[PDB]
A paper describes a structure:
For a more in‐depth understanding of TmCHMO properties, its crystal structure in complex with FAD and NADP+ in the oxidized and reduced states were solved to a resolution of 1.22 and 1.60 Å. The overall structures of the oxidized and reduced forms share an almost identical conformation, with a root mean square deviation of 0.20 Å for the backbone Cα atoms. However, inspection of the active sites shows distinct alterations. In the reduced enzyme, the electron density corresponding to the nicotinamide moiety of NADP+ is disordered, with no well‐defined electron density. Furthermore, R329 of the oxidized enzyme is engaged in H‐bonds with the carboxamide group of NADP+ and the side chain of D59. Upon enzyme reduction, R329 moves away from NADP+ and points toward the isoalloxazine moiety of the flavin ring, which favors an electrostatic interaction between the positively charged guanidinium group of R329 and the negatively charged reduced flavin. Upon formation of the flavin peroxide and concomitant loss of the negative charge on the flavin ring, R329 would shift back to the conformation interacting with the NADP+, thereby making the catalytic center accessible to a ketone substrate.23d These results confirm that the formation of the negatively charged reduced flavin is associated with a localized rearrangement of the central elements of the catalytic site.
Cyclohexanone monooxygenase (CHMO; EC 1.14.13.22) is an FAD‐ and NADPH‐dependent Baeyer–Villiger monooxygenase (BVMO). A wide variety of ketones are converted by CHMO into esters or lactones through the insertion of an oxygen atom on one side or the other of the carbonyl group. Among the retrieved sequences, a putative CHMO from [name] was found (TmCHMO; NCBI RefSeq: WP_028849141.1). While AcCHMO essentially lost its activity after 25 min incubation in 14 % acetonitrile at 20 °C, TmCHMO remained highly active (>80 %) for at least 20 h under these conditions. These thermostability and solvent‐tolerance data clearly show that TmCHMO is a substantially more robust biocatalyst than AcCHMO.
Numbering used by the authors: 6 to 534
Write the structure that this text describes.
Amino acid sequence: TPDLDAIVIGAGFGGIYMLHKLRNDLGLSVRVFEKGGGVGGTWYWNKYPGAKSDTEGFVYRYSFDKELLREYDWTTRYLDQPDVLAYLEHVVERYDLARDIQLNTEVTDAIFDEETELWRVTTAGGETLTARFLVTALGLLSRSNIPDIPGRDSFAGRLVHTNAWPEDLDITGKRVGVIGTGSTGTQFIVAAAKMAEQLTVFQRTPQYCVPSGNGPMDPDEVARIKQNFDSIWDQVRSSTVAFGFEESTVEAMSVSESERQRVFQQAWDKGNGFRFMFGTFCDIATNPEANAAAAAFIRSKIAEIVKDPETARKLTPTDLYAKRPLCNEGYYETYNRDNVSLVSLKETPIEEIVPQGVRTSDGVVHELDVLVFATGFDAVDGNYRAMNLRGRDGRHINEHWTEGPTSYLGVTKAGFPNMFMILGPNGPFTNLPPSIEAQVEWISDLIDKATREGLTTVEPTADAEREWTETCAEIANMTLFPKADSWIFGANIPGKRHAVMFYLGGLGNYRRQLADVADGGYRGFQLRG
Ligand SMILES: Cc1cc2nc3c(=O)[nH]c(=O)nc-3n(C[C@H](O)[C@H](O)[C@H](O)COP(=O)(O)OP(=O)(O)OC[C@H]3O[C@@H](n4cnc5c(N)ncnc54)[C@H](O)[C@@H]3O)c2cc1C
Ligand SMILES: Nc1ncnc2c1ncn2[C@@H]1O[C@H](COP(=O)(O)OP(=O)(O)OC[C@H]2OC[C@H](O)[C@@H]2O)[C@@H](O)[C@H]1OP(=O)(O)O
């Protein structure tokens, strides 16, 4: 007999909903462990100025509770961090979840016992307990990556990663530097430039940013959207990227040059990064000719916006438009401010961090009070590999992942019976809340089957998992995404394996795969009583 039916790790969107399903809906005994001092995941940790959703707020929320969709108000087109956090706190209150979420608790070990067919979890505080089922909602974008830049530990001021931003830090009137220009670093830059006495941006790789279109919502428009949420969510769950817009079915090069310009400009004016990539034409990320056209449009905007042509040049990417789409309010415009400087680390790399700042290879010591690492995450697999997570035969998860992280269907793992993953390796690449929902709901159904039928283990086969790897690789190779150097394929961290880590088929196809597996008697699973 285990201590609990189930243990959930993580109290982000994922673990919150998992706890609700397993405790409230199924009536199991459940505990969540979260290493943070508060619930919210991303939206707890990322307290930096400018932190916000790039999913439009209307669909950056749960959908499973229709009354909550009716009731809950948003007032800005995108949601700032404190607003997403307050939403998640409200959900935890609504479903009486806080009583079974244990904060400040890092799980350091999770070990399957093949004799009792139970999981044993160990906390950093030195406690252990057992459960029948283990759900890891560890986050795809949660394990901070802080590069080992020479001299980093000598810096005498406030040195922080964005995912560890301290609530008390006020950068107003300070000399601030930021390393990194992905989604985090760019939205930070926009906010920080308005506060800092001087902002220095250390940019290794410029990205193709488009407008977000953010601003206030008309409350009459929020009421209309609420009235139409059924249809809105149907469209979301059937789409590829789940961002709440209709995805184009038109090949970019099938129209005239003027029509292509007009479509790109309409999207630019409407805002949203995924809208630019997938709402314009159907083949931006698959057809190099189409991709070139999209990239050219954005470069031409950069050239129009940025007044200093050297600064414009340094901001202008020349690689494939196939990193995760970025958007912001007034990003390129920020570089027209007198108090913002841009350092191209291609041209003048960092030589050394020093007590007073950062020294680049031109010998210039950039003096800083605050140095901000917007350097991203050990994405997807980082918190799995960090854990002492062992399955059958006492084998660590790392022994299974020597050519990249793997799963069956994004949510289970061969050799790890009764372990379910929320946004594990090789799952969907979308607006994440509705993918989380698909996964939580699927996992809930399988766990309930186990309960009703008296199953002691559920596990995927090694063949099924290999087949899923091949499926993901095949889909990924039909796209330009593998040729974009970013965190999505592991390439961002030195020594990390370059490998497919997402199913790139989209949410609608992903939901069908899950459904087809379940309706076919859990094709690929060994179910034992
Ligand atoms: C700044 C930022 C903005 C983003 N904006 C968007 C957006 O607009 N749209 C979108 O679709 N996605 C966005 N994302 C991705 C975002 O993480 C997801 O949308 C969603 O918040 C993921 O929820 P989750 O529960 O899967 O993971 P997370 O919110 O990452 O939560 C996982 C939690 O697990 C905890 N944890 C991990 N390991 C352990 C352990 N061993 N023991 C105990 N606790 C542990 C972590 O502390 C963390 O709190 C963004 C990410 C960032 C960083
Ligand atoms: N050693 C070193 N030196 C200099 N610069 C470095 C270094 N390591 C990383 N970086 C840069 O930091 C940035 C990290 O971006 P990203 O991984 O997208 O992380 P984000 O947090 O912005 O976004 C991740 C996701 O969170 C939410 C949403 O899905 C986002 O995509 C990027 O500009 C990197 O440049 P590089 O040269 O490109 O590697």
